[PDB]
Task: inverse folding
């Protein structure tokens, strides 16, 4: 494949997603086809996350994709700048609808009137619901596959609680799971943090987040969000119960909402991706081991080359390794090597006739590319061991890049000095909005925006330190971002 | 506590139980309904099974855009003039009218087939077998019900493209037997397989296959699943061509199938097994198979009443039985008795205070009202035995309730008599379209062609004449009232 990754990041990414068979383009701009190689990743992420939130009592469901005209701005759910991102159905066939229907850009306007009818007492809480679904956002700044699409797949959770304490607990549990996804499955290191006033979801009380860093572009990307909504929506959609113990006080529910999208797949491509194609974290690669015969003129033993391949396959499916034998004879073995490497398969297993009656095979890992040979009997054992060092390696190496590329700055000239080195940086920060619109202006003369306030900043903020001016309220992570 | 009796008022009875079993909730937009977890659970079980089966025949899951361009939807003869009012069109983004109307997927052929054309550049690239679970909008043609006919629904869409007709035609009937499996092995609804007539099959295809279940209470059958052989109709329009390996420089157009199954299943299972005190759920699809409920309401030993339920719970989770202890205090056992019966849980497990010191408990079945009593120490043995026999009941009772209402008519003489007591009937039928618009007008709200059954109730013989009487009969056709 043509591109490097230092070079022109976009075109490299354009080619890796297309030539690894993950994405296909579509007539309608900003929409993309998820071919099975990519969709499988989403399924693995969804299978992990789904097991997780059922242990916390969340149940899956499905809500309509359509929201009323009346219902959508019946309440101050979103801010005025969100109106342009809403797609409207105007016509059915060619008979104009009496009233425009909107395609859900998020489900809050669709679920919360249901919560209000379901909740008529203390018994009815908590409500913890999840749905995996598609949402369209006519996203104004320009799209690229995965990172920012115009239709995309996500799960969105909405839970309603009677007491504050339970809500604030579920906000961080969900956030730790998101971090689990990025770090246990995708091998991406993340920073947990809270949004500022400029960047928090206006209709809530506070917004939690994880932030990943793409060194090649030098930008951070927010990989997931968990809101504590308090009762802003409770009192607006009138989700009230009366407790007979506390006679005669309207009790509003405490609500959270949380979401995680296919931008996850884009982040894993960008950070682990090389100039030989994709690189797949083993615990997410739909195929972890591809079996190939090579040898790297005779007749009857070529079906015995292929009968041993399907034995290799079956024996490790009994060890629950996901495996595909590539028994196509149409292609040179060398061609399949490039082919499955551009798709980033972690382990290639070569079995040749002169190595077969050696009672063995060679394995090549996609991480480093070195070759080893391990007992035919010792296959279950050793191949699964190799898949795990592949994962810890890709976590470690991407960890080393985030570790190197995140540093502390205390003044503005050297926050600017190190930010134009393509690194993200934590600064003492006021926290107020106008101080922040300014930082991003004075860093163009794109600009650096608030990524988050890390729960665990890199250094303690000392008493009386100021940001630019008012004194500094916390160390916040700043940087250029998607 | 439920209002309607099915016998009395079918529409209201159906509206009453789907809400009060907490399966669906209504919504501002007509024909749209929220699937609460109790319904979505049924759907997920179906999908965990169907996905397992069609993966063994090599289909792969994927996701295609929901928006279809004007050009592509009206590109070729995919649909007909009838089929373009049911399509929802997005025209504006915010207050900015879009240059070109975007249409919301009523099916995905027009999204996928441009993609097959680029993926297929030789016969090595075939077959292509893709499935997607997704939502579909059809702003359709009469007043709606939850499940049975909605305006957005969930389904799976299978699309396969082949080099030879033999392989394609093979997959159309493989798929259909899976649909029959879900309806029959999972849902305990017996079905009849069939082919559509020329009016009723998918116009853009060559022949389209179907399963039909029968709901007695209204007297109507329902189309429960769909498998089309498309021939080279679409390959020729969307130009899915490959080079022939033997004939230098000649295109072969691909052979295509498409098959689909919708959440309309859950509705028909509501209609079929639902009784007059609410739903009945076949156990291998019931998200919870056992409800444990304490009964009898001193504290120090009622704490041993609630701890004994939780050993059953743990004991039955070790047999991979899905079980719920409902140990809530804010509700009386009678209220739970009701609550879970309207949700159709197969086995209710009541424990009353001296049955703990008897080393007993009582088990109640959801179909019959049966009660047994079994020793504490039996965990594996008896509860699974009843969980599996409950399923055999729901199947047969609906099976012979199909053998009830599906009878032979060879003449009209009794066919209209044989149609309108809540009957479905096979007739000798011409095969041509207007004898059928006639049969349905001579019945009235008409008797429609449901399908042409594979494997009918009696063999036909030469020179038999249709109900039309003019032209002779090419096959026995399944007729009846139908949604
Ligand atoms: N257009 C999009 N394509 C893909 N993922 C998206 C898109 N918009 C948002 N996301 C993801 O959805 C998650 C929850 O959505 P959210 O409502 O927080 O979006 P947002 O804050 O408007 O996004 P952003 O700040 O990136 O513009 C985020 O963690 C983000 O990663
Ligand atoms: O962060 C997610 C997690 C999942 C639940 N919902 C919040 C909503 C974010 C709030 N939010 C973001 N973009 C929005 C648009 Cl475009 C509209 Cl119209 C309305 C609201 C919008
Ligand atoms: O059985 C499914 C499986 C997936 C492929 N398509 C067929 C039926 C399409 C045939 N088909 C049925 N209803 C349709 C409407 Cl409303 C429109 Cl607009 C267009 C086509 C329609
Ligand atoms: Mg946005
Ligand atoms: Mg944001
Ligand atoms: Zn400041
Ligand atoms: Zn006729």
Result:
């Amino acid at each position: 494949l043509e591109a490097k990754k230092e070079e022109n990041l976009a075109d490299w990414y354009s080619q890796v997603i297309t030539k690894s068979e993950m994405i296909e383009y579509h007539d309608i701009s900003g929409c993309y086809i998820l071919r099975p190689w990519a969709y499988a990743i989403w399924e693995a992420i969804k299978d992990f996350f789904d097991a997780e939130i059922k242990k916390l009592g969340v149940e899956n469901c499905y809500f309509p994709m359509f929201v009323s005209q009346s219902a959508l701005e019946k309440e101050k759910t979103h801010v005025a700048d969100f109106a342009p991102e809403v797609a409207w159905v105007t016509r059915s066939g060619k008979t104009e609808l009496a009233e425009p229907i909107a395609i859900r850009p998020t489900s809050e306007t669709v679920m919360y009137p249901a919560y209000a009818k379901w909740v008529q007492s203390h018994r009815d809480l908590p409500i913890k619901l999840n749905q995996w679904c598609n949402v369209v956002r006519w996203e104004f700044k320009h799209p690229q596959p995965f990172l920012r699409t115009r239709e995309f797949l996500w799960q969105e959770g909405h839970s309603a609680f009677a007491t504050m304490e339970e809500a604030a607990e579920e906000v961080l549990q969900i956030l730790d799971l998101y971090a689990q996804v990025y770090e246990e499955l995708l091998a991406i290191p993340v920073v947990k943090g809270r949004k500022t006033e400029k960047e928090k979801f206006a209709g809530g009380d506070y917004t939690t987040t994880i932030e990943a860093f793409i060194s090649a572009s030098g930008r951070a990307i927010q990989g997931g969000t968990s809101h504590h909504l308090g009762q802003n929506f409770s009192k607006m959609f009138e989700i009230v119960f009366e407790d007979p113990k506390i006679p005669g006080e309207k009790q509003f529910a405490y609500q959270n909402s949380w979401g995680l999208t296919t931008r996850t797949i884009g982040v894993m491509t960008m950070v682990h991706g090389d100039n030989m194609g994709l690189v797949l974290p083993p615990r997410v690669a739909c195929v972890q081991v591809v079996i190939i015969p090579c040898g790297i003129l005779s007749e009857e033993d070529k079906e015995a080359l292929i009968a041993k391949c399907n034995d290799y396959r079956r024996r490790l499916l009994s060890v629950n390794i996901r495996v595909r034998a590539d028994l196509r004879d149409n292609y040179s073995p060398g061609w399949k090597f490039n082919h499955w490497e551009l798709k980033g398969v972690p382990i290639r297993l070569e079995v040749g006739p002169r190595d077969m009656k050696s009672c063995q095979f060679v394995a090549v890992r996609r991480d480093t590319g070195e070759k080893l040979t391990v007992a035919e009997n010792e296959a279950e054992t050793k191949l699964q061991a190799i898949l795990e060092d592949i994962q810890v390696t890709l976590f470690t190496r991407a960890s080393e890049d985030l570790k190197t590329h995140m540093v502390v700055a205390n003044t503005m000239e050297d926050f600017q000095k190190i930010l134009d080195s393509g690194k993200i940086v934590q600064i003492p920060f006021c926290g107020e909005i106008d101080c922040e619109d300014w930082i991003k202006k004075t860093t163009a003369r794109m600009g650096a925006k608030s990524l988050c306030i890390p729960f665990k900043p890199l250094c303690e903020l000392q008493p009386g330190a100021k940001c630019v001016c008012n004194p500094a309220k916390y160390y916040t992570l700043f940087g250029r971002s998607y």
Residues 88 and 104 of chain B are 5 Å apart (CA to CA). The domain at 10-273 of chain B is CATH 3.30.930.10 (BirA Bifunctional Protein; domain 2). The pocket of adenosine-5'-triphosphate (ligand 1) is lined by residues A 137, 139, 148-149, 152, 154, 222-225, 259, 261, 263 (CB under 6 Å). Chain B touches chain A through 58 residues (CB under 8 Å).
